Amino acid sequence: ELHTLRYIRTAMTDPGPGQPWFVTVGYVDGELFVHYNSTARRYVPRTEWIAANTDQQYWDGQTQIGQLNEQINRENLGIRQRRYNQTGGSHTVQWMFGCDILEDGTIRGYRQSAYDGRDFIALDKDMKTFTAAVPEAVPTKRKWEEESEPERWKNYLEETCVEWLRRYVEYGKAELGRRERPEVRVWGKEADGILTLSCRAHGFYPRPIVVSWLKDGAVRGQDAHSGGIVPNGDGTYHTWVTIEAQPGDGDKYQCRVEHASLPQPGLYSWKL
């Protein structure tokens, strides 16, 4: 199993040009499914399955949650800035929260905030208190615990968040469980006296994947360079791995690609 629901909020003083100062996007199992920003002023579906399995009051309510959060975040930006004796400039509040459903049936919850890209405050593991990462968050810690905020977030994370995640996973079961095969290409580059072999996987899903370079049978990917897993625009992923080879010895290298969508692991040589 292992499903996830995540919301991430960005509130910035300096978006900037033609960009919304406030944004919230939601992800299920690592895939964007809802979106809200201060320009649209509306929560909006980003997958067909969320749009198909909700009614108008879902979007109207979420929209208003976002509009209210938008105001709350406007104020909180001002408050944090003041705690930092900041008078202007680029500053950002980020929030991350959500829940995991592991394939035990066990649950996990997270709620943490950053300020200017650094930890500011977070609800701790037991969800009974908040932990200030910086002295500037101490007063907030105090106010929240005096207001029973930990209890409130514990409730959302363990009940509301989880219950809704179960619905989302149900709604997009087919989409989330689909498989798409990557088209693989190996390409050879030469600008110096060093041969750069590249292997790219295009449009694979799900996310997990293995791409490696072998030098006549032996993974010689101990010195292969990966650009990691990066996203396409259509809900699939891309990855590319290179390796430097002595001119000559180009016919000794093979890229091997393992992925859940494949009939068998792909194995590809370079040929000019």
């Binding site: 939601g26 809200y36 106010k143 207001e147």
Partner: peptide, 8 residues
């Protein structure tokens, strides 16, 4: 579903 942020 998204949820209310707390007031700071």
């Amino acid at each position: 579903i998204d949820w209310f942020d707390g007031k700071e």
